[PDB]
Amino acid sequence: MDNIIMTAYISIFVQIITAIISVYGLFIPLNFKDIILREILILELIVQIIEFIFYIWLIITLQSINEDITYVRYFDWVLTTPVMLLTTVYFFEYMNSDDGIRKKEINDRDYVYLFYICLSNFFMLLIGYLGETKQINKMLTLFGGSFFLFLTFYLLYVKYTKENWMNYIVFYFMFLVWFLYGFAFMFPFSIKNQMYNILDIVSKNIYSIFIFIVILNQSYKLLL
Numbered sequence: 103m104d105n106i107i108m109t110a111y112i113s114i115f116v117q118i119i120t121a122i123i124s125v126y127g128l129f130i131p132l133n134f135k136d137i138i139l140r141e142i143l144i145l146e147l148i149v150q151i152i153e154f155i156f157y158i159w160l161i162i163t164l165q166s167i168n169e170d171i172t173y174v175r176y177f178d179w180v181l182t183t184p185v186m187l188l189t190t191v192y193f194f195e196y197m198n199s200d201d202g203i204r205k206k207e208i209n210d211r212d213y214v215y216l217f218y219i220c221l222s223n224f225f226m227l228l229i230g231y232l233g234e235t236k237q238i239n240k241m242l243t244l245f246g247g248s249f250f251l252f253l254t255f256y257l258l259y260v261k262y263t264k265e266n267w268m269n270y271i272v273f274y275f276m277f278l279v280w281f282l283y284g285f286a287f288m289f290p291f292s293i294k295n296q297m298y299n300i301l302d303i304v305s306k307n308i309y310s311i312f313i314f315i316v317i318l319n320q321s322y323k324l325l326l
């Protein structure tokens with residue numbers, strides 16, 4: 103119980119500071135080519151609203167835990183993970199497009215493919231939820247959930263990446279971190295929840311901080 107709470111507080115600490123940083127980031131002036139970074143940052147903040155509601159619910163609920171509450175995380179994930187996949191797509195498009203590109207152009211062009219990515223991701227989550235609530239066994243959950251994780255990341259890779267180390271860093275870091283949520287699923291209640299509390303810092307807050315630093319680097323001359 104104590105370590106779940108402690109890791110929850112660590113996660114909340116990083117969430118609060120990341121939210122402050124992100125809000126300031128929204129007001130950094132941007133060159134034309136960089137406008138999509140602010141569109142990404144807005145969406146990451148929206149993800150943070152959901153995440154924070156979950157964490158406040160969690161620390162209140164852990165005072166009197168009587169059931170395995172791990173499944174409640176899926177009510178966050180089903181909202182936040184599709185947004186995070188979209189923002190990832192936007193960032194790859196930003197890195198890889200020779201000319202300035204915005205989210206409306208991407209959405210209007212690729213909505214069908216983006217739906218495929220989010221549908222694959224939804225099946226991953228649904229299988230996980232069935233496993234977390236013990237409606238299917240753990241082995242089926244891991245193999246089915248991992249199948250859809252792979253499919254999601256494959257769809258992302260083949261449409262939106264380029265073959266260079268910048269792309270490999272962003273793609274593989276993310277893929278590994280998301281895979282580690284499946285790794286966490288295997289562990290008992292306390293360890294599993296500690297792992298999710300800390301993985302959220304990496305999958306969400308570190309991404310926001312990254313986008314903020316990219317914004318600051320691109321725009322520092324407009325600031326100074």
Ligand SMILES: CCCCCC/C=C\CCCCCCCC(=O)OC[C@@H](O)CO
Binds near residue numbers: 271280309
């Ligand atoms: C235009 C600059 C791009 C430079 C790209 C590579 C350079 C430096 C490393 C940046 C920090 C690591 C990558 C953060 C973005 C990322 O993968 O987050 C995924 C994470 O949340 C977990 O899922």
Ligand SMILES: *C/C=C(C)/C=C/C=C(C)/C=C/C1=C(C)CCCC1(C)C
Binds near residue numbers: 186227231251283302
């Ligand atoms: C902010 C929260 C995030 C990014 C949550 C991510 C969750 C996953 C990538 C879940 C993965 C799973 C597997 C790969 C296998 C089946 C069980 C899951 C759902 C935990």
Ligand SMILES: CCCCCCCCCCCCCCCCCCCC
Binds near residue numbers: 108109296300304
């Ligand atoms: C002992 C049980 C409770 C442990 C609480 C403390 C756990 C802290 C683990 C690290 C937290 C920060 C994670 C940062 C990201 C990991 C590496 C990222 C590389 C880019």
Ligand code: NA
Binds near residue numbers: 170171234236
């Ligand atoms: Na459970």
